[PDB]
RNA sequence: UUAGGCGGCCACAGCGGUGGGGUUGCCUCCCGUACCCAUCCCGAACACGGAAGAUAAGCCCACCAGCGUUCCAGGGAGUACUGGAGUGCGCGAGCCUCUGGGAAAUCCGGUUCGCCGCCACC
RNA sequence: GUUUGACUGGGGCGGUACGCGCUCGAAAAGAUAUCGAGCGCGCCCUAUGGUCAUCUCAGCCGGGGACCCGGCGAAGAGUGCAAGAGCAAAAGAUGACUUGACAGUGUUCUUCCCAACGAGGAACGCUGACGCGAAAGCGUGGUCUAGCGAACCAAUUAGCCUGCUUGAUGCGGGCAAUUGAUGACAGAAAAGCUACCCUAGGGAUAACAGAGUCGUCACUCGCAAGAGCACAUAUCGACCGAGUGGCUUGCUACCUCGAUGUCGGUUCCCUCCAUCCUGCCCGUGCAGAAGCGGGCAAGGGUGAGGUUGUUCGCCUAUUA
RNA sequence: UUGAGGCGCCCAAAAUGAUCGGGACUCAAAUCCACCACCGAGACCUGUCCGUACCACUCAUACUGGUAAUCGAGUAGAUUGG
RNA sequence: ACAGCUGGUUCCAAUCGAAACAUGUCGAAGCAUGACCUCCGCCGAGGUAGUCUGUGAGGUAGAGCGACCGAUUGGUCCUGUCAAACUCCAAACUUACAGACGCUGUUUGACGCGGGGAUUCCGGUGCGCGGGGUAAGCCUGUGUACCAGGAGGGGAACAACCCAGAGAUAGGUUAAGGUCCCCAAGUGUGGAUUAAGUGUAAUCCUCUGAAGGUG
């Protein structure tokens, strides 16, 4: 399971690429979604490769972001352990995070918005003109690499 | 091209194949009593006569076949689509 | 054979056994084919249908298995051909086959030939097959009369082994009569 | 295009690879299809008759009856529904 | 006419003589020079002039460079020196000129050029160890008459 | 299928070559023209009638790779080319990096001298 | 009284990319422009159509560029005509027979990708009548893509409907269809001049200036064959190659057509250097003198006249 | 002696007053390899409100409550309330 | 008088939101019919902008030609080259259909049908692929995104280059870009090169700088 974050805007981006991001529930910059590692989903992220940051996050990181940015299908309600417990098939955020990572469920199945609306990266990111191997922030990331970004966009 | 004066083919009247004779359609003479003839006289006056002041068009490089197919037994003719032919000569 | 661009005919075309242009026209009828084939000593008749992996023979008869019913004469003649067609046709009727089109392969459509004799046989067995009566040999020749009259110019027996001296088109009748009979073990 | 006939720009699609040259096997020309069956359209260069407009090569339509020995296949050209008259010789079963 | 007009490969390959008439003859006199009766393998040293940029070299340039190169080899090794030089490329690409303004612009046929990809051997000479510096000099003069920068590369030769 | 008939795929099946196989069995070559039929001339062929002879042809069986073909390993080659991205480089033609794909020639070693279906048949 | 068309790197001249077919352009589905590259069609054929039987071709080899025999020979022959495609017991050849190049009426595709649009074309049926074949079957012209034409009117084909109170006769009007042309080819019946001109507009489009380009033009550089009595490099300097300028010319059509006043000249001001003189230098085929070539250098100077509107240029006498 | 790479130098002439936007900069305020911390939109996050759409209630298109990560730019033009 | 030509056509707001193309036209400064925009009524459960897989279509790039074809070297089999109108080969990629996931639709009615009303048929630029042309801020295609009709941030200025798509108001954090001054933020750190003021110039009509040469 990988974490997808849009880092590049819609202006001038191919329509078929933009539509791919929308099918992945991301409609704004800094919006994140969790995607299972299947052949079908793999093709989608590869197509979006140049306007996104992705990679498998750690259990902890996912829990921090879920706690801080997860939302119900509708409404303001904070998604904390109690919320997770009173609305989901799990006992707390950790159980949900683990399930998401092991691809046993999805945010929607548990009554949560498929989108984690992140905050801009504190301290700024590495740039949207180059991929990770060139010092940029685009493309596939290391688990440590994704965590750094996700935590900075806490 | 060449073409047989007589040959077996379908007669739409007899409703069966029979020997037909092929002849080129000879132009029938005009009577000068058709409506268009009366309109020409009626409408022609002082100055330009509209459509009646026009003169005969030109010629296509080759004309289509204009034939009559006569049934050799019932004596009734029928017409067919023509085809472009520079010349058409009958064999016999 | 000569290079990458070289065109090798279909196998049955190389072997000179199948006329593919004729085959297509034959298959257009949608009906089963009455495959009439000859050999120097025998005559074969098969009712073949089209199949996913190749032709299907639903019924057949060989001039050799003619003896099984009481045939003591040679097997590469007119009477032999007719009877083999009738036998195949009868077996065809038993298999649920009602109609067929005559396939003569690479043989010639010669009037009074053995393939038409095979055809007449199958038709008499009950099979509806597109045909033309004046292309079939007259009854007597099918019986084998042409051979008896040939032996009439004796001096030396036509047949080497002893089936008979003057030959018997009557034997043909006996066999046909045996086949047209309802009982018969097909 | 310099001309607008049916065979314009069909040099490739209507030509056989040298080895597939010559009269095609009869088996596929006599194949039978049922209404509802999905069929791929592809002209066989060696078979003159029973063809369709070359523009439709590669289409995958639905057999919806027949006219004589030829089949009536339904396709969608862009957004428009069309009916194509074509023989088995230029058709193949999908899957 | 300047080479600036034809040096680039910005046009389709235009070589089909069955659809092109009035093509000027090539000015290139020879492609095989020196002792053409001998083999290249009969020499210890093999030096090639390599083109560093992909370009088109007009037949007039091939002749001028080949001439100035072989002419040197002749002057230093004699009219029958023990060496052999080869110009491996042939001017296949036909050239046009629109010589009315931009109306019916398709140019009339004016010449021919050889398309050479970067890294290719334009010239390859074969000589003995003694005459190695002479062939290097012929090539120096040769690369001054063709558009691209070149490399004088010693292939078979380690008396260095 | 101890030799047959009709085929499907239509060279992995072609080209070329070696060895083996037939008393009332099979296919043939073979023998022969009164007939059905036949040659713009020839029973050559086609057609019909037939077994004295033969396994030399064909055919069937076993096998050889020199040529042609199919596929596979390794090498060429992740090269050539290329879909997506870049305030990367270059005067410029053009190149490079990241991401997703990925040849052809040729060399070398294997493979391939058909496979499969229905029917009939010591 | 009117007409005298359109397209178009402005317009005219030329051409027709004004109706059609093929290869390529076209970016491996489909679609795709230019006065894009190659080139065709406005017919021809009673067989050069149709079917059936028999048969297999180019080309090469061997035996007696005509003929005869044998062998090799998947296709290079032939198939009316462009091009591309198709075809070998055939779609080709030979022979024989035959008239389906038939009447009627449709389905569908095309024309017009997608996506509406006529004529025309094609594919595939049915009804009727036929041809050939043993039969399956083939024949809705030519193996496939060019070979085409509205309404009105006339002529023609077969039957029927109809013309003002009514009957007879004459002569009309109509349903279906064939033929006759509009090539500017989805169809007007059609020549020019205007500097005597006029209006509407356009910088949607030309002349002039500007702008882009730099083939042309000007100048430079690299290499240095060559000659210069010997000597590449005092001097001259080919070929080829690389450039700089924006003075000429050409191209483009960005700017202005509710106007940015023309050429040449003159007068008055500033500037550039690729330097003609002058200053300071280097080389010399530098004795001197007079030169030739080169470097730095734009301070100053670079003038007067004869022909020509001339710019330019030719010519004269002066001049550093 | 010879091979390769980095930066620079020569080649390098234009018209009113030179230029990297200017000043000005040389172990840089240049260039290349790395790295650290910051500044900086109406983007993104967040409070309140408005419009529009939809939902619940309603006679209501009057209130009230709810939903919008998946509503909020716009020439010609179509539609509608004032 | 008529004009297909120029000019002008007067209050507020909310929703949607183009076409600068195709066919025909005495037509190219105009129309009509399609494409596309919008509004209304109808239908009633699927739909398909993305990806994956399966079943099909294809000869462009590249490559190669003792595989055709036609070009194109030399020597006494060998040796030297090519193709827009060549192909024994052959991608990436585009594309028909189907399934799966995704997204969407069944009170926001999708997909589709029927009807009213248009506007539009001078387009332009960037990138990729092009064809013509010495070239062009050239002409003419194609796919896509943008300008046109797109604010705000950056780029000295500057339709289409970068960030970015935007209700009002308010706090905060970033993007592009930038942190010596002008000017918000470093005269930041480790290390090396450059002496030319090279340079302090992504892209570009716009920022030149070449062949050749450099103890
Ligand atoms: Cl006539
Ligand atoms: Cl047989
Ligand atoms: Cl069709
Ligand atoms: Cl209001
Ligand atoms: Cl927007
Ligand atoms: Cl300075
Ligand atoms: K003006
Ligand atoms: Mg929400
Ligand atoms: Mg900050
Ligand atoms: Mg940044
Ligand atoms: Mg009059
Ligand atoms: Mg033997
Ligand atoms: Mg008047
Ligand atoms: Mg006049
Ligand atoms: Mg005009
Ligand atoms: Mg295409
Ligand atoms: Mg035909
Ligand atoms: Mg008229
Ligand atoms: Mg007439
Ligand atoms: Mg017209
Ligand atoms: Mg037209
Ligand atoms: Mg006026
Ligand atoms: Mg203009
Ligand atoms: Mg003025
Ligand atoms: Mg100077
Ligand atoms: Mg001065
Ligand atoms: Mg709005
Ligand atoms: Mg308003
Ligand atoms: Mg409002
Ligand atoms: Mg093609
Ligand atoms: Mg190529
Ligand atoms: Mg394509
Ligand atoms: Mg506008
Ligand atoms: Mg400050
Ligand atoms: Mg500078
Ligand atoms: Mg640059
Ligand atoms: Na009157
Ligand atoms: Na075939
Ligand atoms: Na002209
Ligand atoms: Na050079
Ligand atoms: Na004769
Ligand atoms: Na044998
Ligand atoms: Na006119
Ligand atoms: Na039509
Ligand atoms: Na100019
Ligand atoms: Na210049
Ligand atoms: Na003005
Ligand atoms: Na003046
Ligand atoms: Na001066
Ligand atoms: Na003078
Ligand atoms: Na509006
Ligand atoms: Na008027
Ligand atoms: Na337009
Ligand atoms: Na128009
Ligand atoms: Na007009
Ligand atoms: Na779905
Ligand atoms: Na390429
Ligand atoms: Na926009
Ligand atoms: Na700005
Ligand atoms: Na400077």
Curated annotation (Swiss-Prot), chain A:
GO cellular component: cytosolic large ribosomal subunit
Keywords (A to Z) from UniProt: Ribonucleoprotein, Ribosomal protein, RNA-binding, rRNA-binding
One of the GO BP terms on file: translation
CDD domains recorded: Ribosomal_L7_archeal_euk (cd01657)
SUPFAM superfamilies xrefs: Ribosomal protein L30p/L7e
GO molecular function: rRNA binding; structural constituent of ribosome
Residue ranges with Basic and acidic residues bias: 123-144
HAMAP family (alphabetical): Ribosomal_uL30_A
Job description of the protein: This is one of 5 proteins that mediate the attachment of the 5S rRNA onto the large ribosomal subunit, stabilizing the orientation of adjacent RNA domains.
Family: Belongs to the universal ribosomal protein uL30 family.
Complex and partners: Part of the 50S ribosomal subunit. Binds 5S rRNA.
Protein name listed in UniProt: Large ribosomal subunit protein uL30
Organism (species): Haloarcula marismortui (strain ATCC 43049 / DSM 3752 / JCM 8966 / VKM B-1809) (Halobacterium marismortui)
From Swiss-Prot, chain C:
Gene Ontology molecular function, alphabetical: 5S rRNA binding; structural constituent of ribosome
Domain of life assignment: Archaea
Keywords: Ribonucleoprotein, Ribosomal protein, RNA-binding, rRNA-binding
Keyword rRNA-binding assigned: yes
Disulfide bridge map: none
Pfam families, sorted: Ribosomal_L5e
A cellular component term, taken from the record's GO annotations: cytosolic large ribosomal subunit
GO biological process terms on file: ribosomal large subunit assembly; translation
Similarity comment text for this entry: Belongs to the universal ribosomal protein uL18 family.
PANTHER family named in the record: LARGE RIBOSOMAL SUBUNIT PROTEIN UL18, RIBOSOMAL PROTEIN L5-RELATED
HAMAP family hit by this protein: Ribosomal_uL18_A
Quaternary structure and partners: Part of the 50S ribosomal subunit. Interacts with proteins L5 and L21e, and attaches the 5S rRNA to the 23S rRNA. Has been cross-linked to L21e.
Reported function: This is one of 5 proteins that mediate the attachment of the 5S rRNA onto the large ribosomal subunit, where it forms part of the central protuberance and stabilizes the orientation of adjacent RNA domains.
Protein name as annotated: Large ribosomal subunit protein uL18
Organism: Haloarcula marismortui (strain ATCC 43049 / DSM 3752 / JCM 8966 / VKM B-1809) (Halobacterium marismortui)
From Swiss-Prot, chain D:
Gene behind this protein: rpl21e
Residue ranges, annotated region (Disordered): 1-65
Pfam families per record: Ribosomal_L21e
Domain of life: Archaea
PROSITE patterns documented for this protein: RIBOSOMAL_L21E
Keywords for the protein's UniProt record, in alphabetical order: Ribonucleoprotein, Ribosomal protein, RNA-binding, rRNA-binding
Gene3D superfamilies linked: Ribosomal protein L21 (2.30.30.70)
GO molecular-function terms, A-Z: rRNA binding; structural constituent of ribosome
NCBIfam families: PRK04306.1
InterPro entries listed in its UniProt record: Ribosomal_eL21, Ribosomal_eL21_arc, Ribosomal_eL21_CS, Ribosomal_eL21_sf, Translation_prot_SH3-like_sf
Protein name: Large ribosomal subunit protein eL21
Role noted for this protein: This is one of 5 proteins that mediate the attachment of the 5S rRNA onto the large ribosomal subunit, stabilizing the orientation of adjacent RNA domains.
GO BP of this protein: translation
Organism listed in the record: Haloarcula marismortui (strain ATCC 43049 / DSM 3752 / JCM 8966 / VKM B-1809) (Halobacterium marismortui)
Family of this protein: Belongs to the eukaryotic ribosomal protein eL21 family.
GO annotation, cellular component aspect: ribonucleoprotein complex; ribosome
Subunit structure: Part of the 50S ribosomal subunit. Interacts with protein L18 and binds the 5S rRNA. Has been cross-linked to L18.
From Swiss-Prot, chain E:
Keyword Methyltransferase: no
UniProt keyword annotation of Isomerase present: no
Highest rank taxon of the organism: Archaea
InterPro entries: Ribosomal_uL16, Ribosomal_uL16_arc, Ribosomal_uL16_CS_euk_arc, Ribosomal_uL16_dom, Ribosomal_uL16_euk_arch, Ribosomal_uL16_sf
SUPFAM superfamilies: Ribosomal protein L16p/L10e
Alphabetical list of PROSITE patterns matching this protein: RIBOSOMAL_L10E
Pfam families for this protein: Ribosomal_L16 (PF00252)
CC per GO annotation: ribonucleoprotein complex; ribosome
Alphabetized GO MF terms: rRNA binding; structural constituent of ribosome; tRNA binding
Keywords from the named record: Ribonucleoprotein, Ribosomal protein, RNA-binding, rRNA-binding, tRNA-binding
Gene Ontology BP terms: translation
Known role: This is 1 of 5 proteins that mediate the attachment of the 5S rRNA onto the large ribosomal subunit, stabilizing the orientation of adjacent RNA domains. Modeling places the A and P site tRNAs in close proximity to this protein.
Assembly and interaction partners: Part of the 50S ribosomal subunit. Weakly binds 5S rRNA. Probably binds the A and P site tRNAs.
Family as reported in the entry's similarity comment: Belongs to the universal ribosomal protein uL16 family.
PANTHER family recorded: 60S RIBOSOMAL PROTEIN L10
Protein name in UniProt: Large ribosomal subunit protein uL16
Species this chain originates from: Haloarcula marismortui (strain ATCC 43049 / DSM 3752 / JCM 8966 / VKM B-1809) (Halobacterium marismortui)
Gene (name only): rpl10e
């Amino acid at each position: 399971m990988h974490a997808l974050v849009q880092l590049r805007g819609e202006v001038n981006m191919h329509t078929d690429i933009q539509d791919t991001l929308e099918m992945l529930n991301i409609h704004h910059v800094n919006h994140c979604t969790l995607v299972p590692e299947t052949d079908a989903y793999r093709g989608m992220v590869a197509k979006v490769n140049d306007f996104v940051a992705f990679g498998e996050p750690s259990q902890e990181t996912l829990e921090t972001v879920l706690a801080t940015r997860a939302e119900p299908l509708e409404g303001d309600a904070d998604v904390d352990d109690e919320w997770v417990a009173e609305h989901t098939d799990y006992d707390d955020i950790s159980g949900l995070a683990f399930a998401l990572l092991s691809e046993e469920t999805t945010l929607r199945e548990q009554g949560l918005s498929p989108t984690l609306r992140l905050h801009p990266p504190r301290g700024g990111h590495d740039g949207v003109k180059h991929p990770v191997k060139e010092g940029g922030q685009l493309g596939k990331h290391d688990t440590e690499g994704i965590d750094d970004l996700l935590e900075a966009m806490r | 091209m060449q073409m047989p004066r007589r040959f077996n083919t379908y007669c739409p009247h007899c409703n069966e194949h029979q020997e037909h004779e092929v002849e080129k359609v000879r132009s029938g003479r005009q009577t000068g009593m058709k409506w268009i003839d009366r309109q020409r006289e009626r409408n022609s006056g002082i100055g330009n006569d509209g459509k009646f002041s026009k003169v005969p068009g030109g010629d296509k490089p080759t004309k289509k076949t204009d034939l009559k197919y006569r049934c050799g037994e019932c004596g009734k003719a029928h017409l067919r689509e023509g085809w472009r032919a520079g010349r058409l000569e009958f064999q016999e | 054979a000569t290079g990458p661009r070289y065109k090798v005919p279909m196998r049955r075309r190389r072997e000179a056994r199948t006329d593919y242009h004729q085959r297509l026209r034959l298959l257009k009828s949608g009906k089963p084919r009455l495959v009439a084939r000859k050999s120097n000593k025998h005559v074969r008749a098969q009712l073949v249908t089209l199949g996913p992996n190749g032709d299907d023979t639903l019924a057949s008869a060989h001039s050799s298995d003619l003896a099984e019913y009481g045939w003591e004469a040679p097997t590469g003649n007119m009477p032999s051909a007719y009877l083999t067609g009738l036998l195949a046709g009868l077996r065809a009727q038993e298999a649920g086959v009602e109609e067929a089109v005559l396939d003569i392969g690479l043989n010639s459509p010669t009037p009074g030939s053995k393939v038409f004799a095979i055809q007449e046989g199958a038709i008499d067995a009950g099979l509806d097959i597109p045909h033309n009566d004046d292309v079939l040999a007259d009854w007597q020749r099918t019986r084998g009369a042409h051979i008896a009259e040939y032996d009439e110019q004796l001096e030396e027996p036509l047949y080497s082994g002893d089936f008979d001296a003057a030959d018997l088109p009557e034997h043909f009748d006996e066999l046909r009569e045996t086949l047209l009979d309802g009982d018969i073990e097909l | 295009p310099s001309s607008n006939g049916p065979l314009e720009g069909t040099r490739g699609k209507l030509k056989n690879k040298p080895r597939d040259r010559g009269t095609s096997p009869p088996q596929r020309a006599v194949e039978e299809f049922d209404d509802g069956e999905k069929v791929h359209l592809k002209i066989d260069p060696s078979v003159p008759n029973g063809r369709f407009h070359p523009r439709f090569d590669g289409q995958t339509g639905t057999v919806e009856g027949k006219q004589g020995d030829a089949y009536k296949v339904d396709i969608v050209d862009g957004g428009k529904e069309k009916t194509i008259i074509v023989t088995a010789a230029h058709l193949r079963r999908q899957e | 006419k300047p080479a600036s007009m034809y040096r680039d490969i910005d046009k389709p390959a235009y070589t089909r003589r069955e659809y092109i008439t009035g093509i000027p003859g090539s000015k290139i006199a020879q492609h095989k020079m020196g002792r053409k009766q001998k083999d290249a393998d009969d020499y210890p040293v093999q030096i090639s002039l390599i083109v560093e940029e992909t370009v088109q070299l007009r037949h007039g340039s091939l002749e001028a460079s080949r001439l100035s190169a072989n002419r040197h080899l002749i002057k230093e090794l004699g009219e029958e020196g023990d060496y052999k030089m080869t110009l491996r490329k042939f001017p296949h690409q036909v050239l046009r000129e629109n010589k009315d303004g931009m109306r019916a612009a398709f140019g009339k046929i004016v010449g021919t050029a050889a398309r050479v990809q970067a890294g290719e051997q334009l010239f390859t000479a074969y000589c003995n160890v003694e005459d190695a510096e002479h062939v290097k000099e012929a090539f120096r003069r040769a690369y001054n008459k063709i558009t691209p920068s070149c490399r004088i590369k010693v292939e078979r030769g380690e008396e260095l």
